[PDB]
Design a protein around this ligand. Structure first.
Ligand SMILES: [Ca+2]
Ligand SMILES: [Fe+3]
Lengths: 205, 205, 205
C-alpha cells in the first residue's frame, strides 16, 4: 500500500506552521511583545473546527534600523499576521544576540513574529488617491506625500516642538500670526511724533 | 528501494508554498486587495520552466494598529513578495474575525498576503546617508529623520492644513512672509502725524 | 518498522527554512542588499549547536509602492528577520522581472528577504502612549500622529526646504521670528514726521 505516505505527508504539512491571520490579546509596548490569538480554526480528526491556543511573549515587529523605527499604539483586538520561526527564539529574545534554541519544537507559532495589519479598515481621502499616507485610519489626521509636495492635515493642531524651525523659501499664513504673545495682523509701533503715540490700526500693505 | 521517499520529500517541498517575489496585476485601495502574478516560474516534470497562475483577492499589507496605518498608492506593475497562509483565509477576510477555512488547500499562495517592496528602485540623497527617509523613490520629496533634527523637502510646496500651527521656539523664514494677504516684509502703518499717512517703505530692523 | 518515516519527516522539516532572527554583517544602501548572519544556531547530529553560514546578496525590504517608500540607514549589527524564498531569486533580482530559478535549491535562506526589526530597543515618551511614532529609537526626535493632531519634536531644528510653505489657519510662534534677516519682534518703520526717523522700540500689540 502507498496511501501510507500520503497520510504522512498531509499530517506533516498540517503540523508545519508558517503564517496565519491573528489578533492581539494583550500587548506591552515597552517590551514590544504580545499575547496573540490566531483567527483561523483548525479542523481536527473529528471534523470539528476548533479555536487555536493563545501564543505568549510574541515579539511584534517594530520596523526600523540605524537608530530609527516606526511604532504603532497597538490595542487589544488589533489584527495582523503571525509567522512561525524555524526554531525556538526564546534565548535569542533574552539577549538579542547569537543563541541556541532552548527546545526542539520547530515551525510553530509558539515562537513567532506578529506583524500588525489594518487590512481594509481605513479611509483614503480622494485627494490622496495617488499619494502615500501615514495617517489615522479615519483619514482625518494625515501626512500625505506626493511626487513634488507634502500636505500635513490635522483637525486640531500641528505642533512643532523645536528651538529653531527654518523655512528656506516663503511662507503664507491664512489667518492670524502671533509672535511672543503679540498679534502681528493688528500690531503697531510707538511714534516719535506725536511722542510715544502708537500708530493707528494694524498692519497694512 | 529507498529512492521512493526521496522523491516524495522533494515533491512535497515543491508543493509547499511560503514566499516568492510577485507583481501587482490590479489593486483596489478601498478593499485593500490585489490580483498578484508571481515572478518566478516553476520547472515542471518536462523540464519546462513556466509562468505561474495569477492569485486573486490577495490582501496587501497596510502596516498599522491602534487607529493608525501606512498606505502606499499601489499601481499595476509594482513588485513585492507574496506569502502563503497555512489555511484558507477567505472566511476570515469576509469578517475580519475568528473563522474556519472554507477549503482544504494548505500552504498555497492562493490564500496569501502581499507585501510591497521597491527593492533597489530608489535614490537616497547623500545628505540622508545616516537618516531615515520616507520619500518619493526619486528622492525629490522627502521627510528625513536624523538623530536630533528633521528635514522636510519638497520641490513645489509643503502645506499644513490645520486651524492652529504652533512653534515652541523661534522661526526663520528666508524669503517672503504673507499673513492674511499682507506682505510683512514690505508692510507699514498709518501715522498719527502726519494724520493717516502710511509710514515710508517696509519693515526694517 | 515505521520509525523510518518519522526520521525522514523530522529531517525534512529541519532542512526546510522559513524565518529566523538575523543580523546585518554588511549593507549596501544603493543596491539595497545585505550580507546576513542568522542568530540562532542549529543542533547537529553530534548534539553540538553551531553558528550558521552567512548569506550574501540578500535584498532588504524597502516597503513602498506607487513611487514612494520608507528606507532606514541600516548599520552593521542591526537585527531583524530573514525569510527563505521558495526558489532561487537570483535571476529575478538581476532584472526585477519574470524569471526562472538559476538553481534547484528550495526553501533556503540563501535566497531570501531580510526585514529589519528593532525589537524592544527603543523608548516611547509617555505623551505618545496612544500615538503612532516615527522616531529615533532614543525617542528624542519624532513625528507623533494622534487622532486629531500631529506633534513634530526635534532637539536641534526642524527645517522645511521648499519654495512655498502654506498654513491654512493661524500660527503661533513662542519666541523670535526672523524674516529675510529682519527680526520681526523688534522691528520698526521710517516715519514721515519726523522725516525718515525710525519708530521707537519694537513691535507692540
Ligand atoms: Ca509720525
Ligand atoms: Fe510693523
Amino acid at each position: 500500500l502507498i496511501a501510507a505516505l500520503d497520510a504522512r505527508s498531509r499530517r506533516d504539512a498540517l503540523d508545519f506552521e508558517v503564517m496565519i491571520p491573528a489578533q492581539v490579546v494583550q500587548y506591552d509596548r515597552a517590551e514590544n511583545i504580545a499575547t496573540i490569538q490566531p483567527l483561523i480554526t483548525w479542523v481536527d480528526t473529528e471534523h470539528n473546527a476548533v479555536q487555536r491556543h493563545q501564543l505568549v511573549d510574541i515579539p511584534v515587529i517594530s520596523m526600523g534600523a540605524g537608530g530609527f523605527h516606526i511604532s504603532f499604539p497597538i490595542q487589544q483586538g488589533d489584527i495582523g499576521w503571525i509567522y512561525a520561526a524555524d526554531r525556538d527564539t526564546s534565548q535569542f529574545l533574552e539577549s538579542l544576540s547569537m543563541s541556541k534554541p532552548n527546545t526542539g519544537r520547530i515551525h510553530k507559532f509558539e515562537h513567532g513574529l506578529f506583524i500588525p495589519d489594518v487590512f481594509r479598515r481605513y479611509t483614503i481621502n480622494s485627494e490622496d488617491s495617488a499619494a502615500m499616507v501615514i495617517q489615522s485610519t479615519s483619514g482625518a489626521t494625515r501626512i500625505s506625500i506626493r511626487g513634488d509636495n507634502i500636505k500635513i492635515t490635522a483637525p486640531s493642531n500641528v505642533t512643532v516642538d523645536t528651538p529653531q524651525a527654518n523655512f528656506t523659501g516663503s511662507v503664507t499664513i491664512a489667518n492670524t500670526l502671533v509672535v511672543n504673545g503679540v498679534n502681528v495682523n493688528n500690531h503697531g509701533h510707538l511714534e516719535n511724533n506725536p511722542p510715544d503715540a502708537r500708530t493707528k490700526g494694524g498692519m497694512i500693505a
